[PDB]
């Protein structure tokens, strides 16, 4: 999210 971490795995 904002002020933080999107991860696609």
Request: hydrophobic share 20%.
């Amino acid at each position: 999210g904002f002020g933080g971490n999107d991860n696609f795995g």
